[PDB]
Design a protein around this nucleic acid. Structure first.
Length: 52
DNA sequence: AATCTATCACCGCAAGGGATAAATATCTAACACCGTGCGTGTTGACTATTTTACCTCTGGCGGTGATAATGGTTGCATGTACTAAGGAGGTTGT
């Protein structure tokens, strides 16, 4: 599951992104990992300024 | 290209299963003996191994019959689709 600073619905937009917003739905269902422990964990993802 | 933390797990290291090999006991087989009978030997009489001789098989092949017999057989090449060539001959032209 995921919670994002603009995707309150998929038909939305973010002037400064290049996906606008909808082509972010590409690597979430796509990122995978391993985990030591119990069956619920959390990350955040927090890019600031120009880049990937 | 070295570092490790933090995976999914192999090792960390207790248990226990099968194995095989020892000892025993059974099996069979290898042999040495014996007895049988056959293929151990020379000799001898047989009869039919081979040869040649003779008397007389089998099959080599050469030879050709006569009351007369004197107009014959032969069946389906192909039925389509083409069209290129040669053949015909009268004539209206070259």
């Amino acid at each position: 599951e995921v919670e994002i600073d603009g995707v309150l619905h998929e038909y939305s937009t973010k002037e400064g992104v290049q996906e606008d917003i909808l082509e972010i739905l590409l690597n979430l269902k796509g990122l995978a990992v391993r985990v030591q422990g119990k069956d619920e964990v959390i990350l955040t993802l927090n890019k600031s300024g120009i880049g990937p």
